[PDB]
Amino acid sequence: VILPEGTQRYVGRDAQRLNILAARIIAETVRTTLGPKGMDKMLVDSLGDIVVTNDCATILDKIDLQHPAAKMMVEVAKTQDKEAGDGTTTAVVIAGELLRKAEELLDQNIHPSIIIKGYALAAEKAQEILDEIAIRVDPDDEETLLKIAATSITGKNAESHKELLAKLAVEAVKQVAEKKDGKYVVDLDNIKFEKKAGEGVEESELVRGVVIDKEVVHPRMPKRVENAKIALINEALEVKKTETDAKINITSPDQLMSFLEQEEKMLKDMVDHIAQTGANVVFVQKGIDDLAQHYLAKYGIMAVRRVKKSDMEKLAKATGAKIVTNVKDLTPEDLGYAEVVEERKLAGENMIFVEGCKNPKAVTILIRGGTEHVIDEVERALEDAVKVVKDVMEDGAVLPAGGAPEIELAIRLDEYAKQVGGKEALAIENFADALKIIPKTLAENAGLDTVEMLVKVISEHKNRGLGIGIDVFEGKPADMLEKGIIEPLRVKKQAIKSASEAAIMILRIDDVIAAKA
Amino acid sequence: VILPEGTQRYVGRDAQRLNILAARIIAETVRTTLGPKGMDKMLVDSLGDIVVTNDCATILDKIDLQHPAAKMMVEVAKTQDKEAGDGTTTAVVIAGELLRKAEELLDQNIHPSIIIKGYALAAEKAQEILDEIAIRVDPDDEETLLKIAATSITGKNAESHKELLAKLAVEAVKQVAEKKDGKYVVDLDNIKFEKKAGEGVEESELVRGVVIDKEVVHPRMPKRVENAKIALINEALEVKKTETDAKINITSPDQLMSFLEQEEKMLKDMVDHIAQTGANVVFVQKGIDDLAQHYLAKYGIMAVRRVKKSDMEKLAKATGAKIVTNVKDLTPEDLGYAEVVEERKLAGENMIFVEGCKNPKAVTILIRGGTEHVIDEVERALEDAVKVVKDVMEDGAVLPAGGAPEIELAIRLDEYAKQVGGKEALAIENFADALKIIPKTLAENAGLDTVEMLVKVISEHKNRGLGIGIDVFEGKPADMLEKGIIEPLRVKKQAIKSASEAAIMILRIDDVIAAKA
Amino acid sequence: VILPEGTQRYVGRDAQRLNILAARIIAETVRTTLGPKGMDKMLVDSLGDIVVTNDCATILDKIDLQHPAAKMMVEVAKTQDKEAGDGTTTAVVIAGELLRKAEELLDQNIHPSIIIKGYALAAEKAQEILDEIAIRVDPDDEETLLKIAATSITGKNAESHKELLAKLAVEAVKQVAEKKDGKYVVDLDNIKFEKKAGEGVEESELVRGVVIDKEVVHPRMPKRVENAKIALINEALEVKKTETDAKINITSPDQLMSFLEQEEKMLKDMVDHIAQTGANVVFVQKGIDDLAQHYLAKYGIMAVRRVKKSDMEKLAKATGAKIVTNVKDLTPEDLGYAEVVEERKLAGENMIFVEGCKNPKAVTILIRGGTEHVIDEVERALEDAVKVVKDVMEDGAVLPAGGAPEIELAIRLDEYAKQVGGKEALAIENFADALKIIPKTLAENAGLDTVEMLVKVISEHKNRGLGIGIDVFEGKPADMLEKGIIEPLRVKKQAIKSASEAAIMILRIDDVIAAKA
Numbered sequence A, B, C: 001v002i003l004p005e006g007t008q009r010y011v012g013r014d015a016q017r018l019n020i021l022a023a024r025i026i027a028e029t030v031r032t033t034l035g036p037k038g039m040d041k042m043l044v045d046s047l048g049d050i051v052v053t054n055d056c057a058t059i060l061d062k063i064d065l066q067h068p069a070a071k072m073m074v075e076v077a078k079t080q081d082k083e084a085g086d087g088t089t090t091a092v093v094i095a096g097e098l099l100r101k102a103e104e105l106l107d108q109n110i111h112p113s114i115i116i117k118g119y120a121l122a123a124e125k126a127q128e129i130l131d132e133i134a135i136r137v138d139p140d141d142e143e144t145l146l147k148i149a150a151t152s153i154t155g156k157n158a159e160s161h162k163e164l165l166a167k168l169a170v171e172a173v174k175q176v177a178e179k180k181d182g183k184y185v186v187d188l189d190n191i192k193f194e195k196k197a198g199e200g201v202e203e204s205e206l207v208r209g210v211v212i213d214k215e216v217v218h219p220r221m222p223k224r225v226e227n228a229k230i231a232l233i234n235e236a237l238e239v240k241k242t243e244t245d246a247k248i249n250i251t252s253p254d255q256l257m258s259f260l261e262q263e264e265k266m267l268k269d270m271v272d273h274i275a276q277t278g279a280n281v282v283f284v285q286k287g288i289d290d291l292a293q294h295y296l297a298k299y300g301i302m303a304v305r306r307v308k309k310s311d312m313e314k315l316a317k318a319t320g321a322k323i324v325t326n327v328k329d330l331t332p333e334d335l336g337y338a339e340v341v342e343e344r345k346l347a348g349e350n351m352i353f354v355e356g357c358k359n360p361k362a363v364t365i366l367i368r369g370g371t372e373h374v375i376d377e378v379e380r381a382l383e384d385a386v387k388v389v390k391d392v393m394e395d396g397a398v399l400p401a402g403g404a405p406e407i408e409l410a411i412r413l414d415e416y417a418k419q420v421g422g423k424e425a426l427a428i429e430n431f432a433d434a435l436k437i438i439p440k441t442l443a444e445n446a447g448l449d450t451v452e453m454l455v456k457v458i459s460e461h462k463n464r465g466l467g468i469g470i471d472v473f474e475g476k477p478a479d480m481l482e483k484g485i486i487e488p489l490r491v492k493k494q495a496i497k498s499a500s501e502a503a504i505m506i507l508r509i510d511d512v513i514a515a516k517a
């Protein structure tokens, strides 16, 4: 034929209008979750599985979006979550709003070219305004670092114990943190989250070490060790074999017994190499023969087999131990330390706690909660609580919350609009207006008077200053700095980046050609 | 069941959303025809019938609207066309736009109550402002009446001879106009339109009488009468019969003859009663026997039968003759005068022209054109032309064209908003901004830069005063007064009532319940 | 079979549960139209037809309820509209509400019997409490009568002219009103409503006579009579025939004429009989032969044929004329007087106005307006306005509005519940509570804080007194008496009566058996 049937195409206004609509819809879908008063969503996938969350990234990810432009709105939250860790909603909402105001200009007949260029200037000029107004704080200031973490947790469900969770999140990042070049660098992978139902979120805590979901491989081995000298062996503690094909040919009765002992020996020899280093705790990545388990047990050594590669590494980093491939070359220096290593039946489940390490470079947070739901949402809160603390240590720059930065950006970006002037100024004025959905949908979700509320806030801000924003807990504008309600200078900078990029990306597509969706 | 199935329903956001959207769609369908540059639409009905026009009223009507809120938009053009006769498109567009700016306020969470109240104040205050700025003129000032007529014809197809047509229109309304109470009063029904194909719109002329589409009932009757004495008879010129059932019983041969003669006599006795008044031209509403015809012929009288009651009434006002029910009581005080009455074969189509009438109180405008479409559209042009000339003679007030009044209204109404303040001020301010679609879409249909051109006009007007509007032929702002381009103060006053009412009616519906559409 | 398949049946819990649901659903549908701030609904019948209203009665009637318990809710509005004309929404709401609280008591396992008996006691005590607190007024006090009417018109669309319309209604009812037994008695059938599109609701006038949609039958007759002596003839002015079959047998030529003349004569003598009374205006219920028209024209008499039987009686009551079956007995004492009877062409349509009547016992209200919808709704407003004025003149007792009565009934009916005690007390308490949906949905439709508002109002009322209610225009509690916002003591009495009976009726159905719906 001439072109695949069932393949639709849209051009000009059509393409743009739809893409913008799609994006806007998806955006309004998540805006009901913005801020402390935000509502939750219930996602029921095709396999009955139920996900109840406040998290934008999860919602957009779990929801089966079909329209292309709406799938692009997912990337926005994806990039946000991966760069600043928080403000995923903020970015998606601003992206849709930007796209709405952008259409107003299109209807008005302004060339897409002009709108794009104006958004760029408004965007670039926006970063500038933020870097400048950013309250530069001390990279490791316990004080402000606790606030950043708590303000992040006060946006989701588990805000009932923002106290504890913030403490743990700040604590856990300071521990695994790294600063040998002047400024900090935080590899968050060095923080494992352990979730176990039962108890209360009150029982959640920081394990300065690692928690592994395995058990002691043999009955006779110790279930607890005081000052453990841990050995990390990534080798199969079993009867080795030659690469070259080989088979034993018993020719006389006494051979049956000799060969078995030959292997017992081999097995007992490897275990000896491990006992000699003075190790009383061994984590093996591969398997462990039964006989090897026997000798290991006699020496009063605690061993666990089939340890997850990712677990091995966290043990190495938390105990100071060294992973080895050959037991023969194992030395006491390869061993690591843990003030206590014990198997505990937490919720009828057997887990091993490698706690009380010297100075772990990897640490674990144990999350406790009444239901799977309570837990999964607390973990989601901590991951943001942690990702933001990480941003402040590497950045040493914070901003007030409650739309305060967007209000400032709006007011300011409008002046800039004037000096730019022309068609461009229209785009720059619209872009600056768009930034208001944050303060807007913030008081909205809180059940306040949008229209009226936004007028007092743009007033106070113009009067009192940059620290003025909306306080959904106050129902009135307030100095967010005085209330410690702040957020990473990176969260805003990345939201603005992602949003405008998306907005502009769509504003540039003048034709859509799809086949089956 | 509970509520009939196949019955849909919407509430709140849903209802309004869908109603506003439906209205807007309709509005934007006709907006491409606004102004002199506007475009025509081709409408093909279910029966293959073709209609090409620029008229909103015709379009909204021929197009089969299905959605409820969209049919209510047809009511707006209907009200307008039966009150000011012009600006049907204008009323609709301002209505849709008035709704669009209204949804923006709903989204902002403003109670529909507040918006309606605000739109009411704006609409009320606008009649007031129009009344004020209105340029009072002389009820019969031949001058401004010729402009108003041509400014109207210009905005349509026919603007190619706005000269001739605007003349025929001002001339024809002055002739049939009435005024015995101090002020004029025009009954447009007294102006008949005669459409006939062939020639050019150039041959279109005013007939100070009436054109009728009938023939001279008999071959030997006069095809022309100089100073005609006209008789208007609404009685059948045929052998009357008794209400009481009756039948003749011929009993002897001589009776066949004797009876036929008794009828001839009855027939002739009537033709006599007519000839004796001096009437040389007879118009009969009912039928005419063949003998009654032969007599009228022999007396040199010209007769026409089966004349439309509506045509009889027009001849009554045009020749000053009186309609009579009984020929026996026909006095010559009942005859009428027409300078010439003749049967012309206009396009192979025989017709009777009754021209040269004394002071006709009813007249006829004959239209000529190449195609059926040319004529129909010329007729439509003349109807608005006549209808406007009527508003001025009755109203004695005009306004500048090109969206000048709406621009003045926009500007002033905003100030009013300021002084009214509150949430309503937002409704009022929006209403004011809404009015800008006329200049906006006027320039747009012209091919001008909307955004830019609209800044120029709001400027000039803001400086050079009320007469400044946009001129699609000039492609820039001008003083509409100096250009002579104007419209009736009624056209704008009605467009506002019509549109604002429609808008408020829709804004009030919070629930739609339909069974099959 | 045993019982037709497709015959659903419900019992006890089920039956009552569903009935109460269907009842409440209907109730909630209309409660959004309660009060001055209420919304309108758009009704689209399967044939396309569009109806936009605020009138509960029209909505319940237009919608196609299918459920039995829902249809019963239409009867509530019907009875309300026929006993007090206003408060149709109020009764349907308090009914569904009563059913809601009633089920609460059913779930508590209280026997339907008890709920029914407690509701009857609450209902009974209600009237009593209403008669007592009712503010007795002077049956014809022009003041309170003008309020009642405006207070009523304010609760619908056309409140933009609560002023004009209220006047027209108090006036129209004071006229046609009758009272010879001491107290008043109004027959609203003597108030015809005439609706014609065009103009504004401003030109609405009270024709102290009758407007008829017919025209002067003959051309040569007067289209206007100064001091009319009117004849109401219910007889056909045409050649009478015998009951006994008959037919004329013409035998000689001279007969064709002698017979026609004999009929002309018959006809003429009928007209002579009418002329001899001095009558210049004739209204004939039946036909009017052609000749009969001609003779009537010569005498300079204005005649209209085919007048509606309903119209004839209005003419008889307005002009004082007496309908006559036989022209032969028409005497001058049968004629009636009208200061002016003229054929005016209102809204392009010919009509006959009979105004300036002596002391009309029947009067017409002419309604003007832009669209058909503005018209129909104004009429609905007026019918309620007329009907409330009627209640006060007959009752001579009023009450404050904005829920003031219901608040008083709630507060009071509770103490009554105390003295009754037992399960009954629970039914009585719930009944007293249900009555709050009025103040409740009144503030709710306005957009006020339902919960908080309903507490300020019960407080004030407990303090200031019976006149304390909600003023949707004030957004706060107010003394409705000092405000002039009042309603007929009958409307409230009838609401309780209606609702409680409807409720008790359903509370009594323990089994439902249906075949197809």
Ligand SMILES: Nc1ncnc2c1ncn2[C@@H]1O[C@H](COP(=O)(O)OP(=O)(O)O)[C@@H](O)[C@H]1O
Residues within 6 Å of the ligand: A033, A034, A035, A036, A038, A054, A056, A086, A087, A088, A089, A090, A091, A151, A152, A154, A155, A156, A400, A401, A402, A403, A438, A442, A470, A471, A472, A473, A485, A487
């Ligand atoms: N106490 C508060 N009052 C008003 N706004 C707050 C408060 N705390 C946080 N916010 C705001 O809420 C937003 C974060 O809400 P959230 O639901 O977590 O979505 P997101 O994915 O964008 O972080 C931020 O813009 C922040 O400024």
Ligand SMILES: Nc1ncnc2c1ncn2[C@@H]1O[C@H](COP(=O)(O)OP(=O)(O)O)[C@@H](O)[C@H]1O
Residues within 6 Å of the ligand: B033, B034, B035, B036, B038, B054, B056, B086, B087, B088, B089, B090, B091, B151, B152, B154, B155, B156, B400, B401, B402, B403, B404, B438, B442, B470, B471, B472, B473, B485, B487
């Ligand atoms: N020469 C002109 N220049 C600018 N505007 C004009 C001119 N002539 C008419 N208009 C405007 O165009 C509109 C009338 O256009 P038209 O297509 O006839 O639609 P409508 O049904 O509203 O009369 C009016 O608002 C009028 O002011």
Ligand SMILES: Nc1ncnc2c1ncn2[C@@H]1O[C@H](COP(=O)(O)OP(=O)(O)O)[C@@H](O)[C@H]1O
Residues within 6 Å of the ligand: C033, C034, C035, C036, C038, C054, C056, C086, C087, C088, C089, C090, C091, C151, C152, C154, C155, C156, C400, C401, C402, C403, C438, C442, C470, C471, C472, C473, C485, C487
């Ligand atoms: N100004 C007002 N303020 C508060 N309530 C009012 C006002 N005017 C009327 N009402 C109330 O609104 C109700 C009438 O509203 P309406 O929409 O006409 O419905 P209904 O069919 O019950 O008359 C009455 O109960 C009355 O007390």
Ligand SMILES: [Mg+2]
Residues within 6 Å of the ligand: A086, A087, A088, A152, A155, A384
């Ligand atoms: Mg967050």
Ligand SMILES: [Mg+2]
Residues within 6 Å of the ligand: B086, B087, B088, B152, B155, B384
């Ligand atoms: Mg026009």
Ligand SMILES: [Mg+2]
Residues within 6 Å of the ligand: C086, C087, C088, C152, C155, C384
């Ligand atoms: Mg009412």
